[PDB]
Amino acid sequence: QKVTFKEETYQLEGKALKVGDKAPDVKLVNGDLQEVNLLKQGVRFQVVSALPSLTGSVCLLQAKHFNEQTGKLPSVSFSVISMDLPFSQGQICGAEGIKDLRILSDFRYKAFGENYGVLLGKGSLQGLLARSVFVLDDKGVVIYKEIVQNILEEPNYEALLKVLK
């Protein structure tokens, strides 16, 4: 799969993760500069979403969609990951009224990008995370995957909600 941003085409770097694969646990950093494990136990579905930067317009809509869904379905875990430092994640979420969303930074280890295969290769956005959604079942197996072909498009939310019923 190759992701497009205007005239740029991107190779995805890191290990390819497909529907049926056990999703690896990875170390991320939260707004308190606390190291956390991505995976949550005692939850029917885990939704993990990545975006290139919370400073983007399309990116903010994505974060705002998953913030709202956090309150709507408590039996589902929602996580949003970017390469933004936790400081700017906290400030953007604070400015834009995103107070429920589990917002995590991949900056320290790039473990999410490397292990979910959404690291953007050579180009202006190199080292940022491709716009993407993974859903894991109660056993941490990938049951749904979207890496958005055009990074300026939002994820397919209709496809995602069908998986969560």
Domain that holds residue 127: 2-164
- Residue 69 phi/psi, 5° resolution? -70, -30
> Can you give the length of the chain in residues?
165
DSSP state for residue 165 in the 8-state scheme: -
Strands (E), the chain: 2-5, 8-13, 27-29, 35-37, 45-50, 76-82, 102-105, 119-120, 132-136, 142-147
**Nearest one of 90, 87, 91, 65 to 78, comparing CA atoms:** 65
The CATH number given to whatever domain includes residue 145 is 3.40.30.10
Task: Report the domain count for the chain.
Answer: 1
Q: How far is CA 65 from the centre of its chain?
A: 12
Distance CA 50, CA 141 (A): 18
Positions marked catalytic: 59
Stated in angstroms to one decimal place, the resolution of this structure is 1.8
Structure tokens at 87: 């400081």
